[PDB]
Design a binder for this molecule. Structure first.
Ligand SMILES: [K+]
Ligand SMILES: [K+]
Ligand SMILES: [Mg+2]
Ligand SMILES: [Mg+2]
Ligand SMILES: [Mg+2]
Ligand SMILES: [Mg+2]
Ligand SMILES: [Mg+2]
Ligand SMILES: [Mg+2]
Ligand SMILES: [Mg+2]
Ligand SMILES: [Mg+2]
Ligand SMILES: [Mg+2]
Ligand SMILES: [Mg+2]
Ligand SMILES: [Mg+2]
Ligand SMILES: [Mg+2]
Ligand SMILES: [Mg+2]
Ligand SMILES: [Mg+2]
Ligand SMILES: [Mg+2]
Ligand SMILES: [Mg+2]
Ligand SMILES: [Mg+2]
Ligand SMILES: [Mg+2]
Ligand SMILES: [Mg+2]
Ligand SMILES: [Mg+2]
Ligand SMILES: [Mg+2]
Ligand SMILES: [Mg+2]
Ligand SMILES: [Mg+2]
Ligand SMILES: [Mg+2]
Ligand SMILES: [Mg+2]
Ligand SMILES: [Mg+2]
Ligand SMILES: [Mg+2]
Ligand SMILES: [Mg+2]
Ligand SMILES: [Zn+2]
Lengths: 46, 98, 201, 183, 307
RNA sequence: GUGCUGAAAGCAUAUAGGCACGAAAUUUACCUUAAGAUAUUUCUUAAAUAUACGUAAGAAAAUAUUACGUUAAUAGGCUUA
RNA sequence: CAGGCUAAUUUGCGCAAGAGUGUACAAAAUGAGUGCGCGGUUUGGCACCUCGAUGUCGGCUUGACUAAUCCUCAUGGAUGCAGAAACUAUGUAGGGUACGACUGUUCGUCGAUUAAAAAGUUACAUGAGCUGGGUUAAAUACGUCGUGAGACAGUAUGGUU
RNA sequence: GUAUGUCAAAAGGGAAACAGCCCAGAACAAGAGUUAAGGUUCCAAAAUUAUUAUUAAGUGAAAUAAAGAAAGUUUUUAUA
């Protein structure tokens, strides 16, 4: 995982999802990729 | 700096209502003086200059009523409530394109 | 949604019983949204769910079909629960008639599995416990949830059975949590054909 | 001066009012249509109305120095209405002048330790004048979680119908018609 | 607020009106939630009041020397049971020793009069887990209430030390001795920072003051010996206080309760040693009304000189 | 950080909705002081009770705290171990 | 001198972009010259302000707080994660981070232990709490500069806190 | 330096507190009197006043942190 301020898709399998958003926080934007786990990225700091 | 002059960057809906009514009040003074003379077939150079290069409150854009041109601002615009004695001074026209 | 429009073919034996709009009083909330109790009974068992009221079911008993529809496609909440409520009914119908199954494969030298009874930790009389020898120092035993049938045709093959897919697939993830597949040798617990790409060396 | 000369006994009496935090309030709700969307009075909008009653600012004889406030019984405070995500994101802070002894608690956790009545009192407290009558006035706010309370006999009545009951308005008008039959 | 997050007037009693049977969430605070989050730790059985008599060693066969403290039981009776429907928690009130009737006040003389117990020296409550821990009033507890090897906790008031300094009270290091120090050897030094730290001494600052004479609990102390005739319960290790001071002994909270057989045998021994603890209590309660009614009317002199 | 179900968006998705795993941090638990509701089939009609004084102490700068005062082992003396 | 304004500079950092290195392959790691920024620690600028100072700071006593983490706990990435060790990053500041030698001092340097022997703010945090290593003198000798009286961010010994 | 004003030597209202800003120049009283700046849910005098949209982040609500990122969402212009 890499926490960038500018997350981008690096292949055709990379998906942009917002996870960890619940009634207590807003969550982060994630780049999830099942093909290459090196494309895992996050946007924002806890 | 350290001296706090707490001036917000934008005006409230209550200040805007009075800025609109102050521009519309200066139009009645120029419309009363311009019609009072026309009945006598007379004219003034300052009354003809105003009507030529100055718009009415109904012809101004919202950004020309609540903002002025400041070359030191990022987008060359500044709140009109930042001008000295802005409540008793006329300011309707800004440089073209800005 | 394109899935909520598809009618739901009710196979022979499956019986759907739609309730009436009701509201359970909640002292914590000033207004609860009405729901509808839907029962789907059949040969293997009975499942129930409470759907929002805005979802309308056209239960055709003549042709044994039931199509869903929402009162407003413009609302994001109604578009979402439309496709979701349809996906659950599809599982409920195909879970009470045929049933849901999950196959787990144990890869790795020394990985076994047996279905034995542990009367000490029985949560309900006759509970089955899956005992896994996953190269641990301690034994791993997990009681099958009430409603599921677990069997081991082979030492390295578990077979879970149940009418509730969410319950069957959620219990298979608990077994897989002990040994997640690795990318170097393929050792771990694979659930329903799951595969892992290996490395060159 | 004649307007004030007379018996002001009943103008200074303490009236026991009642409001439910769950009943939709058409006047204190921001959603005014449709009829089914009318919500109850929010926490801060229910607190601003209560603070007005605690101060007696609803009477024609109000004086900030004279303690002419009334009682307010608030029921069903467990179903206190809030908007957005305040319940799980609003924080209440507290300090005892010792560095490091800062206490934080969210509305949902403060509603578990001391119920929803504590969240209402903290709101009505900040809406009262900060003076020596503050704790007297705030003490007249009797907030409960359910429908039960010990003041079911103190609630103001008109002809046997508690105000806020189904048919209290008709009982009030039936007594004013009998009053006008005199000089 | 005054204490915690609550702004409720202290004179208001709203507890009975917020009931879980009406559909309200079970509060996280209150006597109910306090007992639920202490169920495991709470001791199953009551404790005993004992008097610290001294320290010694327990020499064991084959070579074991175990330092131990001797605690004596001096007429330990059960005086009152605190139920949850009446007090809000489960506990047993235990008495120790005796006191002269003249020194016991009338409020307390009529308290023991309604029970059939001679006035005690001290009284203490021991919290029990549930209603199974309440014992008959007026039964004596002997050292056999415990068994050898049972770990217990001993609560006693520590030795008084008067006004202590910074070294003895808080373990302060002090300052130098001869390298130019000026009248500041055992003093506490700095008491704070400067204007950036609040221009004040910070609450909780460690300073000289009184030390000792407070309750201290020693946990997990085995029972090495139990002698009924002597009346002593020898525990391992040290115990807080001086010789002749009363201490409270109970099962350890951080250790599992004694086996079910033991908790029942000890309860079965009170029904044998005291076969009629209720008949003697009901008779004392029946007499208290007669005397309490004679005091009210003013005819108490007649009963005193009746026989 | 890692999952199950699962749509908006026929796919995908631990994104909405419905469940879950998860840290020397947080909360509880543990210990101490404070708080003083409550309890007793408790006492009191000018008292109950407390104080003062005297012998003291498990207490101790003052104060306070905990006992005792002849129907008494509180302190000293004496006697024995 | 400290506080105040600024942030050129810094032994303070982050983000964006990616020439290049990585046998292959930008983003495992690495990151030229730059851009957009935060922050108030170093060296500075200013001068609202006369006051405890030129090493502005050291040691002792006693802390409180911060988190940009040395140790302990959870964890993602790593054709460059087989294991072990180590690297990079994300959570997390509960408790620890010792002892001695030589250096006027902190700068530092080394010795041997240790799970580790990390940092910063608080008027050198703290001299109406201690020290005087310092903060200033008059004595004396030497060195350098000056015609001379003298001067020196010099050197050494001594010097009412 | 220059232009204009205020303070200095100017009280009062607004800017949470405020020499210099926004209003307005205090001889003393009375008045739900008429207004400026500014405001009108409560503290706190006056709208929980009407109309049309956006925001779901308590963003924001009287002192704009930037470049940038992204199936957040709305509208417009094209478009299958
Ligand atoms: K000395
Ligand atoms: K994650
Ligand atoms: Mg300032
Ligand atoms: Mg005020
Ligand atoms: Mg003593
Ligand atoms: Mg020493
Ligand atoms: Mg202060
Ligand atoms: Mg002070
Ligand atoms: Mg799906
Ligand atoms: Mg999936
Ligand atoms: Mg009584
Ligand atoms: Mg008396
Ligand atoms: Mg004394
Ligand atoms: Mg004697
Ligand atoms: Mg290359
Ligand atoms: Mg780290
Ligand atoms: Mg990995
Ligand atoms: Mg490894
Ligand atoms: Mg802790
Ligand atoms: Mg220092
Ligand atoms: Mg000082
Ligand atoms: Mg000289
Ligand atoms: Mg010379
Ligand atoms: Mg000398
Ligand atoms: Mg002057
Ligand atoms: Mg002025
Ligand atoms: Mg204001
Ligand atoms: Mg008026
Ligand atoms: Mg008002
Ligand atoms: Mg905000
Ligand atoms: Zn990818």
């Amino acid at each position: 995982m890499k926490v960038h301020s500018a997350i981008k898709k690096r292949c055709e399998h990379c998906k942009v999802v917002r996870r960890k958003a619940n009634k207590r926080q807003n969550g982060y934007l994630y780049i999830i990729c099942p093909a290459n786990p090196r494309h895992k990225q996050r946007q924002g700091y806890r | 700096g350290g001296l706090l002059w707490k001036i917000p960057w934008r005006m409230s809906k209550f200040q805007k209502l009075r800025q609109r009514r102050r521009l519309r009040a200066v139009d009645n003074v120029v419309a009363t003086i311009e019609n009072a003379l026309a009945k006598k077939g007379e004219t003034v150079k300052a009354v003809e200059r105003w009507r030529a290069e100055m718009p009415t409150e109904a012809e101004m854009l919202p950004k020309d009523k609540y903002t002025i041109f400041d070359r030191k601002e990022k987008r060359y615009r500044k709140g009109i409530h930042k001008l000295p004695k802005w409540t008793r001074v006329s300011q309707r026209v800004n440089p073209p394109g800005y | 949604s394109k899935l909520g429009r598809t009618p739901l073919s009710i196979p022979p034996g499956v019986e759907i019983t739609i309730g009436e709009p009701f509201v359970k009083r909640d002292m914590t909330q000033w207004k609860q949204q009405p729901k509808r109790k839907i029962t789907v009974q059949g040969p293997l068992g009975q499942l129930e769910m409470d759907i929002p009221d805005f979802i309308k079911i056209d239960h055709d008993a003549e042709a044994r079909r039931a199509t869903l529809s929402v009162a407003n496609r413009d609302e994001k909440e109604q578009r979402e629960m439309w496709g979701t409520t349809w996906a659950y009914l599809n599982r409920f119908i195909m879970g009470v008639s045929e049933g849901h199954t999950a196959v787990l494969r144990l890869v790795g030298i020394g990985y076994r599995a047996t279905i034995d009874t542990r009367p000490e930790k029985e949560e309900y009389p006759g509970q089955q416990f899956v005992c896994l020898k996953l190269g641990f120092s301690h034994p791993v035993e997990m009681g099958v949830p009430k409603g599921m049938k677990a069997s081991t045709p082979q030492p390295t093959r578990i077979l879970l059975e149940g009418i509730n897919r969410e319950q069957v697939m959620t219990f298979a993830a608990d077994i897989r949590r002990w040994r997640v597949p690795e990318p170097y040798k393929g050792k771990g617990i694979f659930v329903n054909g799951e595969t892992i790409k290996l490395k060159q060396k | 001066m004649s307007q004030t000369v007379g018996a002001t006994r009943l103008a200074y009496s303490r009236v026991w009012h009642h409001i439910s935090a769950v009943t939709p309030h058409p006047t204190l709700s921001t959603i005014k249509a449709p009829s089914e969307a009318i919500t109850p009075p929010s926490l801060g909008r229910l607190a601003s109305r209560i603070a007005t009653i605690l101060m007696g600012k609803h009477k024609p004889i109000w004086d900030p120095s004279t303690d002419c406030g009334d009682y307010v019984v608030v029921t069903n405070c467990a179903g206190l209405y809030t908007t957005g995500h305040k319940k799980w994101r609003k924080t209440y802070y507290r300090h005892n002048t010792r560095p490091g002894s800062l206490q934080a608690i969210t509305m949902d956790a403060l509603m578990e330790k001391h119920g929803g009545a504590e969240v209402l009192r903290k709101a009505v407290s900040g809406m009262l004048p900060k003076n020596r009558l503050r704790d007297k006035r705030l003490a007249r706010l009797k907030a409960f979680e359910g429908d039960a309370h010990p003041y079911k006999e103190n609630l103001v009545r008109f002809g046997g119908k508690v105000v806020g009951a189904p048919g209290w308005e008709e009982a009030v008008k039936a007594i004013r018609e009998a009053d006008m039959e005199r000089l | 607020v005054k204490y915690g997050w609550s702004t409720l007037p202290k004179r208001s009693r709203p507890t009975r009106f917020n009931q879980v049977t009406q559909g309200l969430p079970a509060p996280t605070s209150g006597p109910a939630a306090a007992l639920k989050r202490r169920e495991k730790t709470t001791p199953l059985r009551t404790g005993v009041l004992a008097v610290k008599k001294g320290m010694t060693v327990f020499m064991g066969r084959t070579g074991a020397r175990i330092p131990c403290t001797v605690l004596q039981l001096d007429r330990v009776q059960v005086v009152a049971n605190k139920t949850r429907a009446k007090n809000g928690y489960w506990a047993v009130q235990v008495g120790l020793g005796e006191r002269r009737a003249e020194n016991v006040g009338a409020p307390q003389l009529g308290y023991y009069e309604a029970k059939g117990i001679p006035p005690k020296q001290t009284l203490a409550e021991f919290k029990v887990r549930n209603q199974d821990g309440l014992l008959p009033v007026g039964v004596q507890l002997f050292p056999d209430w415990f068994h050898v090897g049972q770990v217990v906790d001993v609560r006693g008031i520590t030795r008084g030390m008067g006004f202590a300094g910074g070294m003895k009270r808080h373990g302060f290091a002090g300052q130098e001795a001869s390298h130019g120090n000026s009248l500041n050897h055992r003093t506490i030094g700095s008491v704070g920072g400067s204007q950036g730290s609040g221009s004040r001494v910070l609450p909780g600052k460690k300073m000289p003051g009184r030390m000792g004479a407070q309750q201290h609990t020693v946990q997990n102390l085995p029972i090495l010996m139990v002698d009924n005739e002597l009346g002593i319960v020898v525990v391992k290790g040290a115990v807080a206080g001086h010789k002749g001071a009363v201490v409270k002994v109970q099962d350890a909270v951080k250790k599992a309760p004694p086996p079910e057989e033991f908790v029942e045998a000890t309860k079965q021994l009170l029904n044998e040693r005291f076969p009629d603890a209720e008949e003697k209590l009901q008779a004392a309660r029946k007499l208290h009304l007669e005397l309490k009614e004679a005091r009210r009317q003013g005819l108490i002199d007649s009963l005193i000189k009746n026989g």
